[PDB]
Symmetry: C2
Subunit: 116 residues, 2 copies
């Protein structure tokens, strides 16, 4: 496909960014990213223009609930077998979509490489 | 696939950005982008870290040579039937690849939306 700088249709970008638990074994990535109340990831989404979701084994921080929901077989909880990760989905005008996503990646990198 | 911020393999991004000739009917996009001698696109590549190539109908600015080369059937000149466009190819570390590409898109947008 072509990227048309003058187009009205928005193009999507999606990345599933692993959460580097092995590199930061004691770091509560999930707590940090979500926030009290889910407020952080709310602000994070508001600020970046992007849809950001923590998904995968670990995301609920409740081995029990996760087992139960995975086992229940509901497809919304399907993500629970994936590696813990952050799912960034921008949907924006072609001229701005890489800027959006790079922004979003920058912001997310702030939590995922937190000492850097 | 997953984006792993700590990975050694570089991920590729590629976009074929149309050159907006209809929006700028008298603007010598090809001249501007390439430069005397191909020097501009050389500097442009050096600066952005990316592989940038002008391709498609128009790219050689020589309807003759283009006809001949297309007709010759050599597959290197295959691009000559495509819409005139700029082919941006970054190949960089996952943590930096969207930044690279966004950079490259910014720089290219400078020529392709030249009044903006
Ligand atoms: Cl440790
Ligand atoms: Cl965690
Ligand atoms: Cl005109
Ligand atoms: Cl032109």
């Amino acid at each position: 496909n072509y990227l048309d700088l003058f187009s009205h249709k928005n193009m999507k970008l999606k990345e599933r960014v692993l959460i580097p638990v092995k590199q930061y074994p004691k770091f509560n990535f999930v707590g940090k990213i979500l926030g009290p109340q889910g407020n952080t990831i709310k602000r994070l989404q508001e600020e970046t223009g992007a849809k950001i979701s923590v998904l995968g084994k670990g995301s609920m921080r409740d081995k029990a609930k996760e087992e139960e929901l995975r086992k229940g077989g509901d497809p919304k909880y399907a993500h629970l077998n994936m590696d813990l990760h952050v799912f960034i989905e921008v949907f924006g005008p072609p001229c701005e979509a890489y800027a959006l996503m790079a922004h979003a990646m920058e912001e997310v990198k702030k939590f995922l490489v937190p000492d850097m």
